[PDB]
Design a protein around this ligand. Structure first.
Ligand code: LDJ
Length: 149
């Protein structure tokens, strides 16, 4: 699978994260990210995708060693951690044919797993609008505990 790159943007209090909502198969909330172009460096891909999806330029704030990376279904997604961005920043996608909405979310209120259906004696997981973000939540909380406190 082609690698994807993006960002986890936090505010100045470290208790809110910026998520974006797409359409159709990307109809829920997730971190801004996308697929790398041929010959494009990881940091340049992350900045390009975040600016296309949010209108905010991270290039002068990326730190090379500060990211969370996951391999899901043999595809690799790497999100650079960007703290300290003011909550009154004006965010605007480049293409609203791809992005429905942009919002801050409390990290402590976000889910870190989906719920089962054991009350119905049925296998699988119940739907949740944060499905694309959920895999990053626990590793982000653990990263923030080790780096800050
Ligand atoms: C109404 C809208 C915000 C919403 O929830 N969209 C979803 N689309 N995909 C979902 C399911 C559950 C997780 C796996 O796929 S949830």
């Amino acid at each position: 699978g082609v690698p994807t790159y993006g960002a986890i943007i936090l505010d100045e209090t470290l208790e809110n994260v910026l998520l974006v909502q797409g359409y159709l198969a990307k109809s829920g909330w997730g971190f801004p990210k996308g697929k790398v172009n041929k010959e494009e460096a990881p940091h340049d891909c992350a900045a390009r995708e975040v600016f296309e999806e949010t209108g905010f330029d991270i290039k002068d704030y990326i730190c090379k060693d500060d990211y969370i990376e996951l391999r899901i279904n043999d595809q690799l997604a790497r999100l650079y951690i960007i703290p300290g961005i003011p909550k009154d920043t004006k965010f605007n996608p480049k293409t609203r044919r791809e992005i429905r909405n942009i919002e801050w979310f409390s990290i402590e209120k976000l889910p870190c797993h989906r719920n089962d259906m054991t009350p119905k004696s049925k296998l699988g997981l119940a739907p949740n609008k944060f499905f694309m973000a959920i895999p990053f939540i626990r590793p982000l909380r653990d990263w923030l505990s080790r780096r800050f406190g």
